[PDB]
UniProtKB/Swiss-Prot annotation, chains A, B:
Name by which UniProt lists this protein: Pyruvate decarboxylase isozyme 1
Organism: Saccharomyces cerevisiae (strain ATCC 204508 / S288c) (Baker's yeast)
EC number assigned by the record: 4.1.1.-, 4.1.1.43, 4.1.1.72, 4.1.1.74
GO cellular component terms attached to this protein's record: cytoplasm; cytosol; nucleus
Other known facts: Present with 8966 molecules/cell in log phase SD medium.
One Pfam family per UniProt: TPP_enzyme_N
Cofactor: Mg(2+); thiamine diphosphate
Superkingdom per UniProt: Eukaryota
């Protein structure tokens, strides 16, 4: 008949397919955490710090749909904020629950630990409101279940973080269990019928008239859950389809009509030409950040641009506020095959040639490696690349179909990927134990978040941790200060990290040549995700993908400009 | 004739005795960081993450006077905020400089990396304003030197964090070098003459009448720079002097008139009675947090309480807003000996007896260890204790004279002390390379910030890192959930951390018995700060100082109260 408010939270999370909860304990959340163990199929990660926990919640949300992190008042929540902010920037639905002091402690303005010593229990909530879609600070048991449901709905449908403050005393108060028998509404509201109809009809007419239409899939294609619709759009139209760095993985790269990665002036020449020659651009989920675009270098020759967005549409100069692309895309599928019936297929650019055979002893280089990496990948992989040479290089890697890419192109917080790897691995394990999680992280970035490897070990998760050892911050050495001491790092014994954190079942490997790379990555044993692995990749100090070399120049000039 | 704005910053920091600068590089601060190397006697720490950098700037400011951390826009600054908030809470003067996008980038609202993708370049500044005494976002080269000076002054005189945003383009613009020839004013403004005179006259008359007066030194005695005055006060009056947990170290514990650590009902019975029987209490810098006071358990019998504060005075129920204790204390010293001439010295509580001799095989226990630790400490030591059993236990340790204690009793952010140890060690090195820095940190807390040991190694700093291995979060097990899985941690090979982070010159040790403790800590070579050392201390899971046992129960009740 009745259930505690705390247990209610976890029953709801279970209902929306959140089965791992991230964060760290503190006195203000201990009673809440007890309730996780009362709900079958729910687990507590036990993270090594709160920033890493937030990065992990982000990775989990990307793979699973949404996530939850629980921290403690003041010290826990503020530690998480850079993780939360990146989830806001990149449209990832993370529910941040904070255990806060009891209603009686607040009213008395007790001078408690984890406060600023000034009796203000609102300050941290106010800070988080700047990087949250919405917030709730629970004060009343009577409306608490509805507020929890609102927070969960909002997280999922907006794909932005939400803040939920839960006083320690209130988590043990009873609420009606029958509320759980009615699901949370997790669907978008329908579009205005007339605006949506106008949008669809206009697009259909533009399509019918187009001789060289192209589809360009970007970040929000993935973040706002229109990958299936976009796949169908590609199939029904047969139009050339391109992807951006931030959207990579959102469309299938083995599809015959896939044309490559468009990055404005930093694209391969054949890709730049094929996109920019279009007489109609169907742009799905654009997010035109500097690193996503070669510092805003798009040069479309057409004005016939259709922008699909989560919350609005644009066609040429016409804006349609509130018209959500999810339903526009779904409804377009009804008639688009007929609209596109007269289309004579335009050729798409060929895939970059495979690497030529070279002696085994050939030292490893970045360009070779990213072009070779496609041999190792398999359908279903999660492929995560850290800001630095890795994020820029992965753009040159060809993915199998059904590859989930994670690259934080906009927020760009180094260290993100160690935590994101943990969260992605938990989610992948829940979906299919055979799904591999593959990380490319720099030696510099690893240092910021290295302890989260501990949490991977404790749960027996089996990611591939490729660490690019180029003796420091190479991306920055190219931007400014190639020999500057601030671009150098203390040298760690990377392969000792796993046993130092208590790993028992693991493998470590070092690769420095093309022969060593191929021998390891082609090995059948290595390709089974049977245990956690670290692979230290030895690369030259100043070696970087050519797109990064060019971006670095642009970024340096942007910052130095008067 | 002219100096870049960036170089001006570092010349000013040098003038105010800030010689190590904390933080991490990013494109928005690289040109600024170049300027550190242009000023002799300035160094860049090269931290392993920004949170740890902020914790280190806090430890450095505690020992040296103030500090500076430099981060990059968005991702760097938000990572630091829990460090900054702890510095705000505990009154530590940390200057947080953020490299921000160029003026032209901001004006054009470029969709740059490390933004929320909404064109708002003010959001992180607004967030930091909640935990800063003041802020500055530089936009104008003409007033930039004055703004830098204002931020530096405010950091020092208020001992709170200050936020200073520096656009990347402006750091390379020239300012007049002659401005450096006039020092920044680092002094307090005089008190209101009439108010201060009333306060001094009243205190003096209370003194003359007191038969059992006592001095109680608390957090702000140390934080607001009245240790010297307090020492004089103790000497001129001969009144019994007691200290709080948060103020421990602020008064010399080998002074004949030192009476012990007062923590309300959690004090030794002799100490409680000695303080509470007073007919006058001279309270220097009170900060009455839960952990500092046994949950607000002070039971003063007298109404004759004089509260000295940085920014005001209180005498009985009378408040004197704006009357700063620094000048009150200085001026009191002129007449206090005369006022106290009739005082017949009251006995002070005796020191806790030394541990009884026991056989070498006796397992280590917390109560024994904290009592024994006094044998190892020497004058000039910096002694740092992490939130957890360490912070509670260090209260039971007797300090030599001139010992600097660091315990973050109010903010209580676990992990703080790894960073604080780094910062304290840099500062200690600058003051006197013979000063030892001694850290007691729990196994749980170490996990949050472990990578900062790397930065200690890279600079050849030589702290003693005592790690209390009690297999998890013992403090929390005593509050709630003694066997709860959230209070358990992944087991690390602690002694392998130093070599994993590239240490070459170091020692590691394990102690589990009284014999092993005494053999190690009495050893002559061990007592020399010749190299970095880690000591893993094996302690029982449920063993804790008695004051923590009681505090845990009070805290659990406070949170669970309806
Ligand atoms: C939290 C945070 N701090 C600082 C930066 C600035 N930054 C961007 S890339 C980078 C260096 C990455 O170095 P590494 O991981 O070694 O990559 P690589 O050498 O392969 O380029 C830094 C410090 C950042 N992006 N995020
Ligand atoms: C950043 C942060 N996260 C969580 C907490 C809550 N907390 C307080 S004490 C503690 C456990 C400390 O454990 P450990 O360092 O092993 O100390 P000990 O076992 O000696 O008590 C935790 C998790 C905190 N204070 N700060
Ligand atoms: Mg590197
Ligand atoms: Mg412990």
């Amino acid at each position: 008949s009745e259930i505690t408010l705390g247990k209610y939270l976890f029953e709801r999370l279970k209902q929306v397919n959140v089965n791992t909860v991230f964060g760290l304990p503190g006195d203000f959340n201990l009673s809440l955490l007890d309730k996780i163990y009362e709900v079958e199929g729910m687990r507590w990660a036990g993270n090594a710090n709160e920033l890493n926990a937030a990065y992990a919640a982000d990775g989990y949300a990307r793979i699973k749909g949404m996530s939850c992190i629980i921290t403690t008042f003041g010290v826990g929540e503020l530690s998480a904020l850079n993780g939360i902010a990146g989830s806001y920037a990149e449209h990832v639905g993370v529910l941040h629950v904070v255990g806060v002091p009891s209603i009686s402690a607040q009213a008395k303005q007790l001078l408690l630990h984890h406060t600023l010593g000034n009796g203000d229990f609102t300050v941290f909530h106010r800070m988080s409101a700047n990087i949250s879609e919405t917030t709730a600070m629970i004060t009343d048991i009577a409306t608490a279940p509805a507020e929890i449901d609102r927070c969960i709905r909002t997280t999922y449908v907006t794909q932005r973080p939400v803040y939920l403050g839960l006083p320690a005393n209130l988590v043990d108060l009873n609420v009606p269990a029958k509320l759980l028998q009615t699901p949370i509404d997790m669907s978008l509201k329908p579009n205005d019928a007339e605006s949506e109809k106008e949008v669809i009809d206009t697009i259909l007419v533009l399509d019918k008239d187009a001789k060289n239409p192209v589809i360009l899939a970007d970040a929000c294609c993935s973040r706002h859950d229109v990958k299936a619709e976009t796949k169908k759009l590609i199939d029904l139209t047969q139009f050339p389809a391109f992807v951006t760095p931030m959207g990579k993985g959102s469309i299938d790269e083995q599809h015959p009509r896939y044309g490559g990665v468009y990055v404005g002036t930093l694209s391969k020449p054949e890709v730049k030409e094929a996109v920019e020659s279009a007489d109609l651009i169907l742009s799905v989920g654009a997010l035109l950040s500097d690193f996503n675009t070669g510092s805003f270098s798009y040069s479309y020759k057409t004005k016939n641009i259709v922008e699909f967005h989560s919350d609005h549409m644009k066609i040429r100069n016409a804006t349609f506020p509130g018209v959500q692309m999810k339903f526009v895309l779904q409804k377009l599928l009804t008639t688009i095959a007929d609209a596109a019936k007269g289309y004579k297929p335009v050729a798409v650019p060929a895939r970059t040639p495979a690497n030529a055979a070279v002696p085994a002893s050939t030292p490893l280089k970045q360009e070779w490696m990213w072009n070779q990496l496609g041999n190792f990948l398999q359908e279903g992989d999660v492929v995560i690349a850290e800001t630095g040479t890795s994020a820029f290089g992965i753009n040159q890697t060809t993915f199998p179909n059904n590859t989930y890419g994670i690259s934080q192109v906009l927020w760009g917080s180094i260290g993100f990927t160690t935590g994101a790897t943990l969260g992605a691995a938990f989610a992948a394990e829940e979906i299919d134990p055979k799904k591999r999680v593959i990380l490319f992280i720099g030696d510099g970035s690893l240092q910021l978040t290295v302890q989260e490897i501990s949490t991977m070990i404790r749960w027996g998760l089996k990611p591939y941790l490729f660490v690019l050892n180029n003796d420091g911050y190479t991306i920055q050495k190219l931007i400014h200060g190639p020999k500057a001491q601030y671009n150098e790092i203390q040298g760690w014994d990377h392969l000792s990290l796993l046993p130092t954190f208590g790993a028992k079942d693991y493998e470590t490997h070092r690769v420095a040549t093309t022969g060593e790379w191929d021998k390891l990555t082609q090995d059948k044993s290595f390709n089974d995700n049977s245990k956690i692995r670290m692979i230290e990749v030895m690369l030259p100090v100043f070696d970087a993908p050519q797109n990064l070399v060019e971006q670095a120049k642009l970024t340096a000039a942007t910052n130095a400009k008067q």
